[PDB]
From a paper:
Five total amino acid differences between the 19.3H-L1 and 19.3H-L3 VLs congregated in and around CDR1: 19.3H-L3 contained two threonines (T) and one phenylalanine (F) in CDR1 that were not present in 19.3H-L1, while arginine (R) and glutamic acid (E) residues arose just downstream of CDR1 in the FWR2 region of 19.3H-L1 that were not present in 19.3H-L3. A change at any one of these positions resulted in resistance to 19.3H-L1 neutralization. 19.3H-L1 neutralized 2-B12 more potently than the founder Envs; this was directly attributed to D341N, as this single substitution introduced into Env 0-B24 (0-B24 D341N) increased the founder Env's sensitivity to that of 2-B12. 19.3H-L1 modestly competed with itself but could not effectively compete for binding with 19.3H-L3. The resulting mutant, 2-B12 S335Q, was two logs less sensitive to neutralization by mAb 19.3H-L1 than the parental Env 2-B12, but did not reach the high level of resistance achieved by 2-B12 S335N; in contrast, S335Q had only a slight effect on neutralization by mAb 19.3H-L3. In combination, the structural, neutralization, and ELISA binding data indicate that mAbs 19.3H-L1 and 19.3H-L3 likely recognize overlapping epitopes that are centered on I295 and E338; however, 19.3H-L1 is more dependent on D341N and the N333 glycan motif for neutralization than 19.3H-L3.
Multiple VHs and VLs were obtained, but only one VH, named 19.3H-HC, neutralized the founder Env when combined with either of two highly related VLs. The two R880F mAbs produced by combination of 19.3H-HC and 19.3H-L1 or 19.3H-L3 are hereafter referenced solely by their VL designations. ODA analyses indicated that the antigen-binding sites of 19.3H-L1 and 19.3H-L3 were very flat, forming roughly rectangular shapes approximately 15 Å wide and 30 Å long on top of the six CDR loops.
Residue numbers in the entry:
A (entry chain L): 1 to 9, 11 to 27, 27A, 27B, 27C, 28 to 95, 95A, 96 to 106, ...
B (entry chain H): 1 to 52, 52A, 53 to 82, 82A, 82B, 82C, 83 to 100, 100A, ...
């Protein structure tokens, strides 16, 4: 029941062509030609843009085209225009007679230089520890395009429990901000040597680390 | 044109039940299979359920099977989604969506050609609550280029929003109040930071003024090294 695999972020300058991949398995994308694509603008409902791999509904610009080979379907958007900036989802019929959506891709139409995130990581406060709680605060700002993935480490090992991460929010400078929070018990905090917040943006990771006092 | 109108959304306690409706118009309803697809706040689309043309087998995502039931009333051009044993993770906008191809028994040919605007289902026991505010002290870890970042962590409030000022609004430059995270409990948390000259830390007082109008709670907290 895992989503079909799409890239988090695909971007291009106005006028360029971009392609979004959608990788399933022989149980779905590679099993049938019933692959569809949907465009969703923020605050709005999804709209069908491609169906049965290659077909465009009427009203849909012919700058959009769909294809598929093996377990991967692709949406191509040529002559990128401002209005194309949106989230895009693929979906495929499956061998279980269900319809399964991909994880979605944010398409950015680049209108300023790409900018890696600024990451600031705060340890639990002595006040919070006395309340018998502990929160690590990873603040991520001024990044563009507006998509990041966040991972946390206790010492050198990943931790997934107790993580909550916001979706990126557009700032007044048209870059993006996000936050991630790791909840621990005070004893967890104090036992380990350090914790780390790792933020990946456009394939590159910036890391920050804090330690108990 | 095709119109799909969802209703029935609202706030429900975990373990509770809710029935959604989708009223369709602008096409021959009884000829098409219908779907529910949901979307958690800021997350992706998740297909939920399909009801075929003409009373065959209903199909469901594993995530909801055994708790949700889809059905239709062709005389009323209505699709229903009965939701039982609701969980916080069921919180989402629920969309009604028509299948493109006529008379299909599965959510197969043609994909989902038309969608409603959705109805919000919130599964939560949260109730009005002011935040707990904790300082985020400046230190060497949050200091670069002779500029120190300090902040306030505004935990566990409901509903949105909180506002944060610094020094009663006199400090505005370098202020950043981040968007809130929604916790599994149904409560929110956010942080506000301000960047200041690291040389002023011993001489200047920095206070975050947290205002949570929905609970009528105000907190002023000094933040220092």
């Amino acid at each position: 029941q895992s989503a079909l695999t799409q890239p988090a972020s695909v971007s291009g300058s106005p006028g360029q062509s971009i392609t979004i991949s959608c990788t399933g398995t022989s149980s779905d994308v590679g099993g049938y030609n019933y692959v569809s694509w949907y465009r969703q603008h923020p605050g709005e409902a999804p709209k069908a843009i491609i169906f049965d791999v290659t077909n465009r509904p009427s009203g849909i610009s012919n700058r959009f085209s769909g294809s598929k080979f093996g377990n991967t379907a692709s949406l191509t958007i040529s002559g990128l225009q401002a209005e194309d900036e949106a989230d895009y989802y693929c979906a495929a019929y499956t061998v279980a007679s269900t319809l399964l959506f991909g994880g979605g891709t944010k398409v950015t139409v680049l209108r300023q230089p790409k900018a890696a995130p600024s990451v600031t990581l705060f340890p639990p406060s002595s006040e919070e520890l006395q309340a018998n709680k502990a929160t690590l605060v990873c603040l991520i700002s001024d990044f563009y395009p507006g998509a990041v993935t966040v991972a946390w480490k206790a010492d050198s090992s990943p931790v997934k429990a107790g993580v909550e991460t916001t979706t990126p929010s557009k700032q007044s400078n048209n870059k993006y901000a996000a936050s991630s929070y790791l909840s621990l018990t005070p004893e967890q905090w104090k036992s380990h040597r350090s914790y780390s917040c790792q933020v990946t943006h456009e394939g590159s990771t910036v890391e920050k680390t804090v330690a108990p006092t | 044109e095709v119109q799909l109108v969802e209703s029935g959304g609202g706030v429900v306690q975990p373990g509770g039940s809710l029935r959604l409706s989708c009223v369709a118009s602008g096409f021959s309803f009884s000829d098409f299979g219908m779907n529910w697809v949901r979307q958690a706040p800021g997350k992706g689309l998740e297909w939920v359920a399909f009801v075929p043309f003409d009373r065959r087998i209903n199909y469901y995502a594993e995530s909801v099977r055994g708790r949700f039931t889809i059905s239709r009333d062709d005389s009323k051009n209505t699709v229903f989604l009965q939701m039982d044993s609701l969980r916080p993770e069921d919180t989402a906008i629920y969309y009604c969506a028509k299948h493109r191809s006529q008379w299909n028994f599965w959510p197969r040919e043609g994909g989902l050609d038309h969608w409603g605007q959705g109805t919000l289902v919130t599964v939560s026991s949260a109730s009005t609550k002011g935040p707990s505010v904790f300082p985020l002290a400046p230190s060497s870890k949050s200091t670069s280029g002779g500029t120190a970042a300090l902040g306030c962590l505004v935990k566990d409030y409901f509903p949105e929003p909180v506002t944060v000022s610094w020094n009663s609004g006199a400090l505005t430059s370098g202020v950043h109040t981040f968007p809130a995270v929604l916790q599994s409990s149904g409560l929110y948390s956010l942080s506000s930071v301000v960047t200041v000259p690291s040389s002023s830390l011993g001489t200047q007082t920095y206070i975050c003024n947290v205002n949570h109008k929905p609970s009528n709670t105000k907190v002023d907290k000094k933040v220092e090294p």
